């Protein structure tokens, strides 16, 4: 279920959050407006970059701890209170976060894995109601 799908995923992190924040950004490329220096550049070219491989791995840190942190998929009022209030996300709206989520969940309905799909799409679901909640647009 989902707490196995969170020890997945952390068995192998870095790998993981560059594969999924790619079918994000691949599914949805107008988000690079967020992301600037992305541009311009294919998936492997992206796996060479410093900044990308660093950032994408601490966001999904992050998202690992709020998800482990939830009660069946729902996070903590204090981990929205810290995704709205933190300075790199000033730009952002609730769609922003949705759209991460439709793809996180695509990835895992297209994986051989038998991750809990369902849960992930409940938990995204869940973490967009509690940051509109912490005051995001
Ligand atoms: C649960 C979802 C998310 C978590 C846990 C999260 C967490 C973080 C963390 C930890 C950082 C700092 C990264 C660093 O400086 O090394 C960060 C930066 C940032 N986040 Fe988020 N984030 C999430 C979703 C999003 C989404 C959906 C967007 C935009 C579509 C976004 C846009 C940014 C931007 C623009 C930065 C700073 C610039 C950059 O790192 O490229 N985040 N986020
Ligand atoms: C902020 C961020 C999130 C996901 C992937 C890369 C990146 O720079």
């Not at 796996?47 to 966001?59: Q, R």
């Not at 996180?104 to 894995?113: D, H, I, N, P, T």
Request: net charge neutral; glycine share 6%.
């Amino acid at each position: 279920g989902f707490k196995q799908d969170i020890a997945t995923l952390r068995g192998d992190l870095r790998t993981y959050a560059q594969d999924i924040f790619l079918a994000f950004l691949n599914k949805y490329p107008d988000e690079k407006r967020n992301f600037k220096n992305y541009v311009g550049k294919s998936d492997q070219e992206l796996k060479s970059m410093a900044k990308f491989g660093d950032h994408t791995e601490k966001v999904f840190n992050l998202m690992m701890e709020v998800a482990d942190r939830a009660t069946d998929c729902v996070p903590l009022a204090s981990d929205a209170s810290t995704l709205v209030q933190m300075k790199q996300h000033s730009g952002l709206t609730t769609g922003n976060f949705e759209k991460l989520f439709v793809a996180l969940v695509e990835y895992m309905r297209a994986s051989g894995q038998s991750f809990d799909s369902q849960s992930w799409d409940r938990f995204g679901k869940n973490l967009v109601s509690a940051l509109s909640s912490a005051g995001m647009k």
